[PDB]
């Protein structure tokens, strides 16, 4: 899966 | 006051192991992903690893990747750093850094470092 | 990896001057994922542009970031004694890598 997806919960 | 507080730096014997620590506040620590970049002596910024806001998914520099381990405690507004087989390379300044709100995972708070030393 | 290339190495400007710091990549930043950070010494870095041109909270509006794809730039429009520091480009879409920095010191 991708490293520079959104992290944040929203 | 959103602010971020590294420890844990120390010196270690190469290939021994050593856990960072850096405590939040002044916000919802449980909503952000956060990282870990260093900054070796005279040398400039290298990424080493990224966790989800739930402690789900995590992701590490190539020149880590094996050795070290993102965690965090969202219960304790308190994320880690294990670092085990440590080298030379990896003596630095380790910050940790909070993930901003706009598009992507780019760094918007910054803690003030904590130093490690790995040398026998 | 995407190389982020800085110049100059070093900038020697006076205050009220104009500053333009560039940056360029290997490959094509995906989304526009281009930040730019100030560093003074013995501080950890701050950040200062995000998107390539958004600025951060509490920056001033003399800092501006410009630039797509490869070739990004930050202009200082009218430089103030704090800004003489280390500013690092990073892009954040193809993993997380930083550019080696360029040092704006004081010309005398």
């Known amino acids: 899966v991708d490293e520079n997806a959104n992290a944040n919960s929203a | 006051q959103v602010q971020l507080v590294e420890s844990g730096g120390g010196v270690v014997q190469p290939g021994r192991s050593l856990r960072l620590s850096c405590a939040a506040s002044?916000?919802?620590?449980?909503?952000?992903?956060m990282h870990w970049v260093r900054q070796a002596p005279g040398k400039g910024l290298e990424w080493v690893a990224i966790?989800?806001?739930?402690?789900?998914?995590?992701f590490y520099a190539d020149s880590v990747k094996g050795r070290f381990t993102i965690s965090r405690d969202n219960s304790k507004n308190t994320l880690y750093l294990q670092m085990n087989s440590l080298r030379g390379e990896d003596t630095a300044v380790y910050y940790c850094?909070?993930?901003?709100?706009?598009?992507?995972?780019?760094?918007?708070?910054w803690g003030k470092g904590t130093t490690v030393t790995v040398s026998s | 990896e995407i190389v982020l290339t800085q110049s100059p190495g070093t900038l020697s400007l006076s205050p009220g001057e104009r500053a333009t710091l560039s940056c360029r990549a290997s490959?094509?930043?995906?989304?526009?994922?281009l930040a730019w950070y100030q560093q003074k010494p013995g501080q950890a870095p701050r950040l200062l542009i995000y998107?390539?041109?958004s600025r951060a909270t509490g920056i001033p509006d003399r800092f501006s970031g410009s630039g797509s794809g490869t070739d990004f730039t930050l202009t200082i429009s009218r430089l103030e004694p704090e800004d003489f520091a280390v500013y690092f480009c990073?892009?954040?879409?193809?993993?997380?890598?930083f550019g080696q920095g360029t040092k704006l010191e004081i010309k005398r």
């Open positions: 998107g390539a041109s």
């Open positions: 850094a909070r993930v901003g709100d706009g598009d992507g995972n780019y760094m918007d708070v």
């Open positions: 002044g916000f919802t620590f449980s909503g952000s992903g």
């Open positions: 490959q094509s930043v995906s989304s526009s994922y």
């Open positions: 990073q892009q954040y879409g193809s993993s997380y890598t």
């Open positions: 966790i989800w806001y739930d402690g789900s998914n995590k």
